Design a protein around this nucleic acid. Sequence first.
DNA 1: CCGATCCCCTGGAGAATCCCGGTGCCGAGGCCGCTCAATTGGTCGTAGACAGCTCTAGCACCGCTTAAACGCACGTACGCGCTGTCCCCCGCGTTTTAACCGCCAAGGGGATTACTCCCTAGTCTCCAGGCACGTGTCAGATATATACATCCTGTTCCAGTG
DNA 2: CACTGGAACAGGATGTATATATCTGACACGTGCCTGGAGACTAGGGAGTAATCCCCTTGGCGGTTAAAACGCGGGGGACAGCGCGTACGTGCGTTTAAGCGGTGCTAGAGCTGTCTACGACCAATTGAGCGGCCTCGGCACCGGGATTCTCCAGGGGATCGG
Lengths: 93, 93, 102, 40, 101, 98, 95, 84, 82, 74, 107, 107, 71
Amino acid sequence: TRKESYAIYVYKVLKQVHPDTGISSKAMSIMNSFVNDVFERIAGEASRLAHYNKRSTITSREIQTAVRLLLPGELAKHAVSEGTKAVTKYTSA
Amino acid sequence: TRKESYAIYVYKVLKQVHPDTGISSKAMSIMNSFVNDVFERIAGEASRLAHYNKRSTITSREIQTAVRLLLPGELAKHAVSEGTKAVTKYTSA
Amino acid sequence: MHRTTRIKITELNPHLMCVLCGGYFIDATTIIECLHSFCKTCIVRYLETSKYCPICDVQVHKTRPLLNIRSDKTLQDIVYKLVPGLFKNEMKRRRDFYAAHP
Amino acid sequence: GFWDCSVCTFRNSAEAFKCSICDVRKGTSTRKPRINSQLV
Amino acid sequence: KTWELSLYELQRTPQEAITDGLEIVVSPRSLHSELMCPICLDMLKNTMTTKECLHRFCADCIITALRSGNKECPTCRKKLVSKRSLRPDPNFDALISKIYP
Amino acid sequence: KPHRYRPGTVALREIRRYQKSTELLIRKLPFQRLVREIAQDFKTDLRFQSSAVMALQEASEAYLVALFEDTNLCAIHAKRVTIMPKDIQLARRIRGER
Amino acid sequence: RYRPGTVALREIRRYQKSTELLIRKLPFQRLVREIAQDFKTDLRFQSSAVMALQEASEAYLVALFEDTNLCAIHAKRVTIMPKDIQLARRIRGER
Amino acid sequence: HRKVLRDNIQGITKPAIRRLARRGGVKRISGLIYEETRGVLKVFLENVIRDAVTYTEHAKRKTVTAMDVVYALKRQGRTLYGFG
Amino acid sequence: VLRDNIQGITKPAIRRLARRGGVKRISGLIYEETRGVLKVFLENVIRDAVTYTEHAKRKTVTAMDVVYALKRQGRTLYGFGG
Amino acid sequence: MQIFVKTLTGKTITLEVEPSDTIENVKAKIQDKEGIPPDQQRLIFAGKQLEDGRTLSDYNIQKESTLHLVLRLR
Amino acid sequence: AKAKTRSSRAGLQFPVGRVHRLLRKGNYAERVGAGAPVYLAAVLEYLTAEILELAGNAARDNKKTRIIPRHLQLAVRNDEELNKLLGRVTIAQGGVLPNIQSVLLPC
Amino acid sequence: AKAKTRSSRAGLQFPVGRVHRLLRKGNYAERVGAGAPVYLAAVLEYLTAEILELAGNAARDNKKTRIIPRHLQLAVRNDEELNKLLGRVTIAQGGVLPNIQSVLLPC
Amino acid sequence: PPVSELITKAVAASKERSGVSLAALKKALAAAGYDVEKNNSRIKLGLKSLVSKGTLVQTKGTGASGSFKLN
DNA sequence: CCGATCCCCTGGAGAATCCCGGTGCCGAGGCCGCTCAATTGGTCGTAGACAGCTCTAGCACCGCTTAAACGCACGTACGCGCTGTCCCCCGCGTTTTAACCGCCAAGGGGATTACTCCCTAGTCTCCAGGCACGTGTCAGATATATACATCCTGTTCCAGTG
DNA sequence: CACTGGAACAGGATGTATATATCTGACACGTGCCTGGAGACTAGGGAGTAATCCCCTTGGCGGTTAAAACGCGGGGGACAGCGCGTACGTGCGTTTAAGCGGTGCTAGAGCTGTCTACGACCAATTGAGCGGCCTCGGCACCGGGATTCTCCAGGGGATCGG
Ligand SMILES: [Zn+2]
Ligand SMILES: [Zn+2]
Ligand SMILES: [Zn+2]
Ligand SMILES: [Zn+2]
Ligand SMILES: [Zn+2]
């Protein structure tokens, strides 16, 4: 039975950042757990906001507010910039 | 517009317990918030259990396990007893 | 050890004028959210009416952009040394203006 | 009527809601109180 | 606060740009203090400027200094948390490349 | 010679009174002005419901009372009866807020 | 022979530079089984579960020891005693 | 604007800090406790107010509500009862 | 019955843990205090894990159950899945 | 005969007494055997506090009975 | 046929129907069972009854007949298990339990 | 027409489609917008890139060519913002930061 | 001069109801001008000598502590 | 055998706090109308409980090697009184200042209603992205020798006293 | 001229970082395939927009005190120095059992087929619960005794010197 994980994507990012560096299995599992935890936190915050304002949709505005709520300071600023640029690039195509 | 609350039910319980005591508005708000908090905690735990076990239904067994995880000691024991008694009365009636 | 270089000021001019006034950097002040430098008077006059950078339109601050401006002494010294006689000219204008209204 | 304290078994009167000797709060019908003030 | 214009600063006139075709002659030490890295004691390359103190360093120099420890400014001892407290300086890069290609 | 109480008696009396009481201790108008001061940085021309500032005051008072209790425990552990900034700093560091 | 303190500092450096576990596997496993014996009879345990339990326990103990060291140092001493641990747990909120 | 509100953090008076300490069970207070307490209170209020303003701005409103303040406190782990 | 298994947590092991924590001098009762603290912590975590596996209609405790218990208690652990 | 006394610390003590013995003698004996001041001791049986000058027979105390001892600082 | 409430069926005071509706629209799961709302209502009713009994005892200890947040805080902080359940919650106008460190008292 | 992946459409590396499916099946809300998964994928990619870059720098300092949990722990704990984000998380086989209290240093 | 007569002057300076305390004599010597920091052992042995010879007796304390008074 | 110096005991003046009885006021509790959501009754689709089978990973046991734990002797340095100085909070009286309360007035925006349109769920067909599996090669753990940094004690020199 | 101590230095033992050889198991890449993601297309409801009402927030004015601020005298607690003795670190020799590698067995986790009962969805209906109104009694505030708790002066009592 197939069990999915973010291994290939994390490896692609690692090759993008450091061309000649590898990663071991324990660190791979650690990164997978980290990604899952951050995903669940952001999704929970967005769902809470959507229920909170009497709405039934989770949109980019809700995700942006959740990210700003969670990430501290410069991390939140850069994440917001990346999200907005990605959304503009995707919708202008 | 309508704003639902637990005031009348808590007042009924207070009349079952202490037949000669009243409750103020602020204490009413305190009790309402307490009930809401417990309800959301138990519901979240049950939903998490169902997602972990690859199930799509919230049942009395899930509620029982969530109560056992949440409430400490004698509170959990007596809550489990009361819940089982109420469920069996409802089914046999 | 490098040598002594003789180069066009015209080739260097592009990175030396404040776009708000069109003239060379005078008492330079930089916004840090995009690292953009202008004249102090120019930028403070701009910030009283708008909250976005003159070039890339990035918001300097949510409420008070006056909190996000820093004096660029290094840039001011570099432009002073690049432009010949600029400091003497400015000093002369300061004394001339101050010699009339004490 | 009177009630018996769990901590010290004293036959305490109904009108009192603190025990006369050990000064421990009376408990609820289902859950009775437990060891309080471990020091004598 | 600390930004109110002075009496002269209210109406100072702009300085005209020199369109004359004359050359600038610069010794290799004229802009030494302005173009030398405080860490490696050499010229800048991939300039990183701090957000709080506007101090310029080499990217590798400052990254190694911050990673080693003492997360403060090597020049004015002001603290900086991580890489996000610095920004690249294309203006400085272009000016340096022009002055000393 | 008038009447004078030795040091500590009035402190204990005030402790008993303020532990038996339940009212707020900080003044409404100064707390409101401080709240508006802090909120002025994020947005401009905000408005505040009265219940909002009441809730903020309640939370602040509870937090300060808990911090002072932990400070007293630290000072007692250090074999003293006077609370100090070192005690406050140790309590906060161990709690994990700094 | 060395004066007291030298070996202590050397061991501190050595064990702060390494990441291996410091508690014996079989005794920890027996302790876990005995503790779990009271809750359900005839249970079974996975090796990964036992290792996860050991990792969590060691991390918690190390954090508590750092806190008790800070408390003892604040008490103007260099020796840790049980009251330091008790105060650290009281402030943390575990007691 | 209405006013550049400034120098209002000193609203908490020394007697007020002393009253809070007395409620907490403190007998003897040094001289620097006041400044330390003012700093701590300022940090706490800054965090909570930032959270509440973020909620209000997401709601597209202009008035901070007790509901938003309660939600911010719940987000920070400081659940509060009595205001809905 | 399994007995005297807490004595398997040895004084040298407690010394090594304290050394990693940065402790230079240890009294004589720290060992017993540490044993008690560890027993309480393990009791709580094991109770949560046993509740989970009992609900799952299984008879072997798994690393997923342990990780879920730790997450519930506020001690999230990375590296073993989830 | 022999009777028992139970304390709040989980400690159970035994005493050798007679039905004709008084409460004063009993608190003298606990003074002798454990050092507890008689003034701070309160004795409980059948939910009733024992009086100072009464006897064990007046309360119908039988052999191997267990009293309850409470200590309140004076 | 005459309608009889599920609360009357289970001998409970709480709104089993309202709890069921909240669970359905609470976005907790795709579907919900039948006895889950009854069980949750019974647990809530038991907790409320315990809290109200303790609060009423505390209130009558002060020769008054109205429950207040002071009495609520007294009961909650004096019950060990209830305090453990409510450790991280603040109660408005609740006050603080009176206690004094022994070293601070004269002796 | 030839199929083009949404991740390539948005210029990302992470599985926008998988994120969108997980948002569907997680019972987070009744409906999920089209622009929501892109934002979340971009944020996750940015965080992963940052932590991986710091870990790689640490590994290169330690004269090794493979990232290990020790390097991950060093990278996380040496950065204030990441440490605040992961304050409650334990990394297996991570060890602790080298730190000795100054007064324990012999003068 | 050797510390003997300075100690006599220190003890004779006050001669109050009780004896002079150790900190008081250190303060007096420091005010008069002397390196009491590096002469703690010297002053301790001097105290021992002038309590052995019976010139000055110790009031209440033991060893070098307490107060001293002249005979 | 009396001064006088410190130590333990008691009474009474003085301030704080509890207990009782009066008075007034506002919000807690009970009643009336209505309306919307919980009940009852039916149909339909699939979620999961049950039974069967497979194979894997957990438990139990053996023997050997050697690293770790235990017990003991010995010295030393650190914790714990004990004393003494001094300085800094505490309690209190007098001046001052701004918070509270009551009252008014303006208008901003929060909350509600009606309309509409385009955005996302649902369904079908098609295909390639990623996952399980297999395999080769070098990153890295271990073993061994070596040079450098730390640490400790014995001796030596220069400055005090008798 | 003959004692002491306190600062300074040098060699030996120890530990740790540095330089090579090895051999091996885990990582990185290639392959087949199948399930999940992408492309088209329809329908209906959620959210955006415009208009309106009136609830509540902001701002200003005057008195009345209650609290805040300032200065003074003094006692008690924080801090520094000193001595003692006991617990703790260090090193050695002996005992214990953990870790390794291998075997054997089987209880139970995991996957698959089926079929039935349980829960969602829809209509008609009616009664519980929410909003509005009002009124009377518990509680807040007042004042006067009565009671409890502090604090200091006067007074016996043991003891050194004379
Ligand atoms: Zn300009
Ligand atoms: Zn810009
Ligand atoms: Zn009792
Ligand atoms: Zn450089
Ligand atoms: Zn700087």
